[PDB]
Structures are given as C-alpha cells and as structure tokens.
Amino acid sequence: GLSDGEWQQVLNVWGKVEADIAGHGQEVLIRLFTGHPETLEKFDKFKHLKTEAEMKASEDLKKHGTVVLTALGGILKKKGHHEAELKPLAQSHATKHKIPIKYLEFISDAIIHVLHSKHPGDFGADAQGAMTKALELFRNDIAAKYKELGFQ
C-alpha cells in the first residue's frame, strides 16, 4: 500500500545503492552481524569472522551482500507485485535457513542505518518514510508465508 509518489522515492533512493551495490551490501551485513551476533551464527561460512576487520576484509561477505541487495532491488522494482519473487525466499529462509522474522526486522533497520551513514543529509525524511514502508511491505508479505508454513 505505497502511493505512486512513495514508490518513486523508494526507487530514487535505491539508485544510490546501485552505484555501489557491494559496498552497501557489505555495510548492511556488517551492521546486522555486529548489532546482532546471533545472525552471524546462521551462516556456517561467516562464523569464522571474529572481528569487524575480518568481516571488512572478507570478499565472500561482500559477495553475499551483492546477492542479497540484488534480490531486494529486484523485489522493490516490482512495487509490491512481488509474490513470485517472495515465495522462494520465504521458503528458503523459513524452512532451510531457519531465519526468524525478527532477523528480517533487524536487517531492515540496518538498511535504513546504512543509507544515513553513507548518504548523510541526502536521505530526507520523506525518503526514509517511503523506504521504511517498502521494507515493512516486504516483511509483512514474508510473514504471511511464514505463518502458512507454521514457522517460528
């Protein structure tokens, strides 16, 4: 339930991310892992990352960041018509990776934080409002699939 104006703000902000998808992806995941170390335990391949320096130096972490933000970008460009894109991610995250919805809230908050940090004074109040609604829409739509699967 975003307006046309709100979707336009979302995809304008997303333009910023696309100019450096790997840099943004890395900073999001580092923000998530340092803020919520339980999220790092869900990745067998990042458990070895003890320090933030190790995270920063990890080319594989940056690669995962690219994968995640590429997928999210695809979803956002559907402007809420994203059932086909969400279905497999709900299934993998609930059934295989065992990711509680709470951790999706954590990464949503990390995206907002990273946008301010990399674009200080260039991520206006209207843009934060619109990006927040988009990310809540994503979370709400994943949550419905989690409930269908009985996932906690």
Side-chain angles (χ1 to χ4, degrees):
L2 276 72
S3 72
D4 298 319
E6 282 171 342
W7 282 121
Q8 179 175 58
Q9 272 278 225
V10 174
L11 297 183
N12 182 254
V13 168
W14 198 255
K16 307 187 154 76
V17 175
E18 286 184 337
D20 180 16
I21 193 84
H24 286 78
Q26 174 185 247
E27 283 190 36
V28 166
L29 294 175
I30 288 176
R31 176 75 182 175
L32 179 70
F33 293 160
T34 61
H36 314 270
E38 62 275 28
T39 63
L40 182 77
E41 293 308 296
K42 295 287 179 170
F43 293 85
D44 304 316
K45 71 183 166 174
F46 300 138
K47 281 188 178 182
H48 68 99
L49 294 172
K50 285 299 171 305
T51 56
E52 189 176 336
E54 294 177 319
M55 287 172 192
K56 206 77 184 287
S58 170
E59 292 305 307
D60 200 57
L61 185 156
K62 193 172 321 193
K63 191 180 167 188
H64 196 73
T66 298
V67 164
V68 170
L69 295 192
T70 299
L72 184 58
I75 289 163
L76 292 174
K77 290 173 195 309
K78 292 313 246 265
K79 299 199 298 174
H81 292 94
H82 55 213
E83 165 62 22
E85 290 80 1
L86 258 57
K87 188 195 189 56
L89 292 175
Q91 296 165 336
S92 67
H93 286 60
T95 304
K96 182 183 195 310
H97 311 313
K98 313 279 184 196
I99 305 308
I101 193 85
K102 183 53 151 208
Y103 296 8
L104 306 178
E105 181 190 359
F106 297 158
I107 202 176
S108 298
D109 291 350
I111 288 164
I112 296 293
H113 190 269
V114 169
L115 287 170
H116 279 300
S117 180
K118 294 185 71 59
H119 309 281
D122 192 39
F123 180 43
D126 52 353
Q128 177 177 165
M131 185 60 75
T132 300
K133 282 186 73 174
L135 289 174
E136 285 168 343
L137 183 65
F138 168 75
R139 210 150 67 238
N140 182 83
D141 285 352
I142 287 275
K145 304 293 193 45
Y146 273 35
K147 179 169 173 273
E148 163 191 336
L149 295 170
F151 187 63
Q152 293 303 318

mmCIF file of all heavy atoms in Angstrom, residues 92-124:
data_model
loop_
_atom_site.group_PDB
_atom_site.id
_atom_site.type_symbol
_atom_site.label_atom_id
_atom_site.label_comp_id
_atom_site.label_asym_id
_atom_site.label_seq_id
_atom_site.Cartn_x
_atom_site.Cartn_y
_atom_site.Cartn_z
ATOM 1 N N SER A 92 12.965 -20.604 1.540
ATOM 2 C CA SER A 92 14.339 -20.922 1.930
ATOM 3 C C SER A 92 14.626 -20.399 3.332
ATOM 4 O O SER A 92 15.245 -21.100 4.149
ATOM 5 C CB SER A 92 15.394 -20.475 0.946
ATOM 6 O OG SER A 92 15.482 -19.067 0.856
ATOM 7 N N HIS A 93 14.142 -19.186 3.640
ATOM 8 C CA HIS A 93 14.511 -18.570 4.904
ATOM 9 C C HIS A 93 13.774 -19.237 6.065
ATOM 10 O O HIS A 93 14.357 -19.432 7.135
ATOM 11 C CB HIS A 93 14.411 -17.041 4.781
ATOM 12 C CG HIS A 93 15.535 -16.480 3.975
ATOM 13 N ND1 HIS A 93 15.835 -16.773 2.660
ATOM 14 C CD2 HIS A 93 16.496 -15.673 4.407
ATOM 15 C CE1 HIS A 93 16.952 -16.117 2.316
ATOM 16 N NE2 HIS A 93 17.372 -15.411 3.372
ATOM 17 N N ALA A 94 12.505 -19.618 5.879
ATOM 18 C CA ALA A 94 11.773 -20.310 6.926
ATOM 19 C C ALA A 94 12.250 -21.761 7.092
ATOM 20 O O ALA A 94 12.545 -22.190 8.217
ATOM 21 C CB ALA A 94 10.302 -20.293 6.654
ATOM 22 N N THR A 95 12.322 -22.496 5.966
ATOM 23 C CA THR A 95 12.402 -23.951 6.002
ATOM 24 C C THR A 95 13.858 -24.393 6.039
ATOM 25 O O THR A 95 14.182 -25.351 6.735
ATOM 26 C CB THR A 95 11.596 -24.589 4.855
ATOM 27 O OG1 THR A 95 10.237 -24.152 4.904
ATOM 28 C CG2 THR A 95 11.559 -26.097 4.905
ATOM 29 N N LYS A 96 14.751 -23.707 5.315
ATOM 30 C CA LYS A 96 16.121 -24.174 5.211
ATOM 31 C C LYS A 96 17.025 -23.386 6.146
ATOM 32 O O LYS A 96 17.722 -23.992 6.953
ATOM 33 C CB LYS A 96 16.604 -24.097 3.761
ATOM 34 C CG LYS A 96 18.015 -24.606 3.516
ATOM 35 C CD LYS A 96 18.423 -24.418 2.072
ATOM 36 C CE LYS A 96 19.642 -25.223 1.696
ATOM 37 N NZ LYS A 96 20.740 -25.014 2.667
ATOM 38 N N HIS A 97 17.027 -22.044 6.042
ATOM 39 C CA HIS A 97 17.978 -21.261 6.812
ATOM 40 C C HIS A 97 17.495 -21.036 8.244
ATOM 41 O O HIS A 97 18.315 -20.740 9.109
ATOM 42 C CB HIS A 97 18.334 -19.948 6.112
ATOM 43 C CG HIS A 97 18.696 -20.108 4.680
ATOM 44 N ND1 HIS A 97 19.571 -21.046 4.163
ATOM 45 C CD2 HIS A 97 18.217 -19.405 3.644
ATOM 46 C CE1 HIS A 97 19.622 -20.866 2.850
ATOM 47 N NE2 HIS A 97 18.807 -19.869 2.526
ATOM 48 N N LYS A 98 16.183 -21.176 8.493
ATOM 49 C CA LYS A 98 15.618 -21.054 9.829
ATOM 50 C C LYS A 98 15.831 -19.653 10.397
ATOM 51 O O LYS A 98 16.323 -19.489 11.518
ATOM 52 C CB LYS A 98 16.236 -22.090 10.767
ATOM 53 C CG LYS A 98 16.305 -23.501 10.222
ATOM 54 C CD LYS A 98 15.035 -24.275 10.336
ATOM 55 C CE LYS A 98 15.230 -25.699 9.849
ATOM 56 N NZ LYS A 98 13.933 -26.367 9.584
ATOM 57 N N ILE A 99 15.387 -18.652 9.639
ATOM 58 C CA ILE A 99 15.596 -17.244 9.968
ATOM 59 C C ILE A 99 14.307 -16.669 10.531
ATOM 60 O O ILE A 99 13.354 -16.474 9.759
ATOM 61 C CB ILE A 99 16.012 -16.423 8.729
ATOM 62 C CG1 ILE A 99 17.246 -16.994 8.019
ATOM 63 C CG2 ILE A 99 16.197 -14.965 9.118
ATOM 64 C CD1 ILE A 99 18.439 -17.239 8.907
ATOM 65 N N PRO A 100 14.232 -16.346 11.846
ATOM 66 C CA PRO A 100 13.026 -15.738 12.399
ATOM 67 C C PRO A 100 12.733 -14.383 11.748
ATOM 68 O O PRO A 100 13.636 -13.689 11.273
ATOM 69 C CB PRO A 100 13.297 -15.583 13.909
ATOM 70 C CG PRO A 100 14.564 -16.374 14.192
ATOM 71 C CD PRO A 100 15.267 -16.565 12.870
ATOM 72 N N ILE A 101 11.442 -14.024 11.707
ATOM 73 C CA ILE A 101 11.019 -12.778 11.106
ATOM 74 C C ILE A 101 11.720 -11.585 11.766
ATOM 75 O O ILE A 101 11.987 -10.590 11.096
ATOM 76 C CB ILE A 101 9.478 -12.657 11.126
ATOM 77 C CG1 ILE A 101 9.001 -11.522 10.218
ATOM 78 C CG2 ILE A 101 8.918 -12.538 12.533
ATOM 79 C CD1 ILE A 101 8.860 -11.954 8.772
ATOM 80 N N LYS A 102 12.004 -11.699 13.072
ATOM 81 C CA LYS A 102 12.721 -10.702 13.850
ATOM 82 C C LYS A 102 14.045 -10.342 13.170
ATOM 83 O O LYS A 102 14.409 -9.171 13.126
ATOM 84 C CB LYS A 102 12.962 -11.244 15.274
ATOM 85 C CG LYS A 102 13.640 -10.295 16.269
ATOM 86 C CD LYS A 102 12.922 -8.964 16.355
ATOM 87 C CE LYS A 102 13.032 -8.241 17.682
ATOM 88 N NZ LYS A 102 11.837 -7.382 17.894
ATOM 89 N N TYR A 103 14.741 -11.324 12.596
ATOM 90 C CA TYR A 103 16.015 -11.037 11.945
ATOM 91 C C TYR A 103 15.807 -10.253 10.642
ATOM 92 O O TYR A 103 16.685 -9.483 10.230
ATOM 93 C CB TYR A 103 16.806 -12.300 11.635
ATOM 94 C CG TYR A 103 17.277 -13.138 12.818
ATOM 95 C CD1 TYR A 103 16.874 -12.871 14.124
ATOM 96 C CD2 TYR A 103 18.124 -14.226 12.606
ATOM 97 C CE1 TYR A 103 17.290 -13.671 15.181
ATOM 98 C CE2 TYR A 103 18.564 -15.016 13.653
ATOM 99 C CZ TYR A 103 18.135 -14.741 14.941
ATOM 100 O OH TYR A 103 18.574 -15.524 15.965
ATOM 101 N N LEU A 104 14.663 -10.450 9.964
ATOM 102 C CA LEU A 104 14.316 -9.600 8.836
ATOM 103 C C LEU A 104 14.054 -8.167 9.301
ATOM 104 O O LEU A 104 14.385 -7.214 8.601
ATOM 105 C CB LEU A 104 13.105 -10.178 8.086
ATOM 106 C CG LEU A 104 13.270 -11.636 7.636
ATOM 107 C CD1 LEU A 104 12.018 -12.144 6.937
ATOM 108 C CD2 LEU A 104 14.461 -11.781 6.730
ATOM 109 N N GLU A 105 13.482 -7.984 10.494
ATOM 110 C CA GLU A 105 13.332 -6.634 11.020
ATOM 111 C C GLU A 105 14.710 -6.021 11.283
ATOM 112 O O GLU A 105 14.933 -4.870 10.960
ATOM 113 C CB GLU A 105 12.521 -6.687 12.307
ATOM 114 C CG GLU A 105 12.278 -5.330 12.948
ATOM 115 C CD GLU A 105 11.682 -5.424 14.349
ATOM 116 O OE1 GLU A 105 11.442 -6.546 14.830
ATOM 117 O OE2 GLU A 105 11.469 -4.386 14.954
ATOM 118 N N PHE A 106 15.636 -6.805 11.845
ATOM 119 C CA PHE A 106 16.982 -6.307 12.107
ATOM 120 C C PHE A 106 17.633 -5.822 10.811
ATOM 121 O O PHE A 106 18.219 -4.745 10.783
ATOM 122 C CB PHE A 106 17.866 -7.384 12.755
ATOM 123 C CG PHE A 106 17.473 -7.918 14.120
ATOM 124 C CD1 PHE A 106 17.933 -9.165 14.538
ATOM 125 C CD2 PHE A 106 16.712 -7.172 15.006
ATOM 126 C CE1 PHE A 106 17.613 -9.669 15.790
ATOM 127 C CE2 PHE A 106 16.405 -7.672 16.267
ATOM 128 C CZ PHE A 106 16.851 -8.917 16.649
ATOM 129 N N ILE A 107 17.548 -6.591 9.715
ATOM 130 C CA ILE A 107 18.259 -6.183 8.509
ATOM 131 C C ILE A 107 17.581 -4.966 7.868
ATOM 132 O O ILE A 107 18.240 -4.158 7.223
ATOM 133 C CB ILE A 107 18.462 -7.363 7.529
ATOM 134 C CG1 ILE A 107 19.620 -7.093 6.565
ATOM 135 C CG2 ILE A 107 17.188 -7.701 6.786
ATOM 136 C CD1 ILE A 107 19.957 -8.230 5.622
ATOM 137 N N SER A 108 16.267 -4.837 8.029
ATOM 138 C CA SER A 108 15.524 -3.681 7.545
ATOM 139 C C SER A 108 16.026 -2.399 8.209
ATOM 140 O O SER A 108 16.261 -1.393 7.547
ATOM 141 C CB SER A 108 14.055 -3.864 7.766
ATOM 142 O OG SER A 108 13.617 -4.981 7.030
ATOM 143 N N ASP A 109 16.217 -2.466 9.524
ATOM 144 C CA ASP A 109 16.741 -1.368 10.311
ATOM 145 C C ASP A 109 18.187 -1.074 9.906
ATOM 146 O O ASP A 109 18.586 0.087 9.839
ATOM 147 C CB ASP A 109 16.656 -1.687 11.805
ATOM 148 C CG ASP A 109 15.246 -1.744 12.369
ATOM 149 O OD1 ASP A 109 14.307 -1.355 11.661
ATOM 150 O OD2 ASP A 109 15.103 -2.181 13.513
ATOM 151 N N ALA A 110 18.967 -2.125 9.619
ATOM 152 C CA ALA A 110 20.343 -1.940 9.168
ATOM 153 C C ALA A 110 20.380 -1.194 7.825
ATOM 154 O O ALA A 110 21.212 -0.331 7.616
ATOM 155 C CB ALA A 110 21.040 -3.266 9.072
ATOM 156 N N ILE A 111 19.472 -1.511 6.904
ATOM 157 C CA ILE A 111 19.441 -0.817 5.625
ATOM 158 C C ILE A 111 19.212 0.670 5.849
ATOM 159 O O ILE A 111 19.913 1.483 5.278
ATOM 160 C CB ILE A 111 18.368 -1.459 4.724
ATOM 161 C CG1 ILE A 111 18.833 -2.834 4.254
ATOM 162 C CG2 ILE A 111 18.015 -0.551 3.568
ATOM 163 C CD1 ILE A 111 17.740 -3.705 3.684
ATOM 164 N N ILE A 112 18.269 1.019 6.725
ATOM 165 C CA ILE A 112 17.984 2.429 6.982
ATOM 166 C C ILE A 112 19.202 3.112 7.583
ATOM 167 O O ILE A 112 19.564 4.210 7.165
ATOM 168 C CB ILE A 112 16.744 2.572 7.868
ATOM 169 C CG1 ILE A 112 15.513 2.025 7.126
ATOM 170 C CG2 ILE A 112 16.561 4.001 8.358
ATOM 171 C CD1 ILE A 112 15.079 2.807 5.920
ATOM 172 N N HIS A 113 19.874 2.422 8.496
ATOM 173 C CA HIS A 113 21.038 2.989 9.143
ATOM 174 C C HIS A 113 22.127 3.264 8.107
ATOM 175 O O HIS A 113 22.752 4.330 8.123
ATOM 176 C CB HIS A 113 21.609 2.013 10.174
ATOM 177 C CG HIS A 113 22.639 2.659 11.020
ATOM 178 N ND1 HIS A 113 23.984 2.662 10.734
ATOM 179 C CD2 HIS A 113 22.486 3.395 12.106
ATOM 180 C CE1 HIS A 113 24.611 3.369 11.657
ATOM 181 N NE2 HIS A 113 23.713 3.811 12.507
ATOM 182 N N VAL A 114 22.400 2.258 7.251
ATOM 183 C CA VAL A 114 23.482 2.365 6.271
ATOM 184 C C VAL A 114 23.207 3.496 5.268
ATOM 185 O O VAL A 114 24.127 4.211 4.875
ATOM 186 C CB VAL A 114 23.741 1.007 5.600
ATOM 187 C CG1 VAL A 114 24.660 1.140 4.390
ATOM 188 C CG2 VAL A 114 24.304 0.029 6.611
ATOM 189 N N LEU A 115 21.942 3.649 4.835
ATOM 190 C CA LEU A 115 21.557 4.752 3.967
ATOM 191 C C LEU A 115 21.917 6.099 4.600
ATOM 192 O O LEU A 115 22.508 6.930 3.932
ATOM 193 C CB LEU A 115 20.069 4.647 3.624
ATOM 194 C CG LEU A 115 19.707 3.537 2.639
ATOM 195 C CD1 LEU A 115 18.213 3.356 2.542
ATOM 196 C CD2 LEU A 115 20.286 3.817 1.260
ATOM 197 N N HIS A 116 21.634 6.313 5.896
ATOM 198 C CA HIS A 116 22.022 7.572 6.522
ATOM 199 C C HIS A 116 23.542 7.705 6.604
ATOM 200 O O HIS A 116 24.110 8.785 6.410
ATOM 201 C CB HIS A 116 21.366 7.715 7.904
ATOM 202 C CG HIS A 116 19.951 8.190 7.864
ATOM 203 N ND1 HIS A 116 19.557 9.402 7.316
ATOM 204 C CD2 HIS A 116 18.823 7.591 8.305
ATOM 205 C CE1 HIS A 116 18.237 9.505 7.438
ATOM 206 N NE2 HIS A 116 17.777 8.430 8.030
ATOM 207 N N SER A 117 24.211 6.609 6.938
ATOM 208 C CA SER A 117 25.642 6.636 7.189
ATOM 209 C C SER A 117 26.444 6.944 5.915
ATOM 210 O O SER A 117 27.472 7.631 5.968
ATOM 211 C CB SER A 117 26.038 5.324 7.796
ATOM 212 O OG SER A 117 27.422 5.289 8.056
ATOM 213 N N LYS A 118 26.005 6.388 4.770
ATOM 214 C CA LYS A 118 26.731 6.550 3.519
ATOM 215 C C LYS A 118 26.238 7.782 2.768
ATOM 216 O O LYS A 118 26.950 8.256 1.893
ATOM 217 C CB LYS A 118 26.577 5.305 2.637
ATOM 218 C CG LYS A 118 27.219 4.051 3.211
ATOM 219 C CD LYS A 118 27.174 2.853 2.302
ATOM 220 C CE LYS A 118 28.103 3.010 1.121
ATOM 221 N NZ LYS A 118 29.506 3.190 1.579
ATOM 222 N N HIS A 119 25.044 8.297 3.124
ATOM 223 C CA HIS A 119 24.419 9.408 2.428
ATOM 224 C C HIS A 119 23.918 10.453 3.424
ATOM 225 O O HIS A 119 22.764 10.872 3.332
ATOM 226 C CB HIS A 119 23.304 8.901 1.505
ATOM 227 C CG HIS A 119 23.763 7.800 0.606
ATOM 228 N ND1 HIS A 119 24.492 7.991 -0.555
ATOM 229 C CD2 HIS A 119 23.625 6.473 0.745
ATOM 230 C CE1 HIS A 119 24.776 6.803 -1.077
ATOM 231 N NE2 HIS A 119 24.247 5.874 -0.311
ATOM 232 N N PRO A 120 24.773 10.947 4.357
ATOM 233 C CA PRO A 120 24.300 11.830 5.420
ATOM 234 C C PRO A 120 23.797 13.132 4.837
ATOM 235 O O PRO A 120 24.493 13.748 4.028
ATOM 236 C CB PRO A 120 25.533 12.052 6.304
ATOM 237 C CG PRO A 120 26.707 11.794 5.361
ATOM 238 C CD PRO A 120 26.221 10.665 4.465
ATOM 239 N N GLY A 121 22.573 13.509 5.194
ATOM 240 C CA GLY A 121 21.988 14.739 4.692
ATOM 241 C C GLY A 121 21.438 14.608 3.274
ATOM 242 O O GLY A 121 20.971 15.597 2.714
ATOM 243 N N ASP A 122 21.469 13.390 2.717
ATOM 244 C CA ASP A 122 20.972 13.116 1.383
ATOM 245 C C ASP A 122 19.931 11.992 1.429
ATOM 246 O O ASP A 122 19.630 11.368 0.419
ATOM 247 C CB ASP A 122 22.137 12.736 0.462
ATOM 248 C CG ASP A 122 21.727 12.735 -0.998
ATOM 249 O OD1 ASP A 122 20.950 13.625 -1.380
ATOM 250 O OD2 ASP A 122 22.216 11.895 -1.740
ATOM 251 N N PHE A 123 19.360 11.742 2.605
ATOM 252 C CA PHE A 123 18.318 10.725 2.772
ATOM 253 C C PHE A 123 17.241 11.385 3.633
ATOM 254 O O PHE A 123 17.241 11.265 4.868
ATOM 255 C CB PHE A 123 18.906 9.425 3.334
ATOM 256 C CG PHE A 123 17.941 8.288 3.558
ATOM 257 C CD1 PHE A 123 16.979 7.988 2.613
ATOM 258 C CD2 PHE A 123 18.059 7.458 4.668
ATOM 259 C CE1 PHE A 123 16.124 6.923 2.793
ATOM 260 C CE2 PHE A 123 17.219 6.368 4.837
ATOM 261 C CZ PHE A 123 16.235 6.118 3.910
ATOM 262 N N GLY A 124 16.359 12.109 2.934
ATOM 263 C CA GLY A 124 15.428 13.026 3.549
ATOM 264 C C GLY A 124 14.306 12.291 4.260
ATOM 265 O O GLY A 124 14.152 11.072 4.128
#
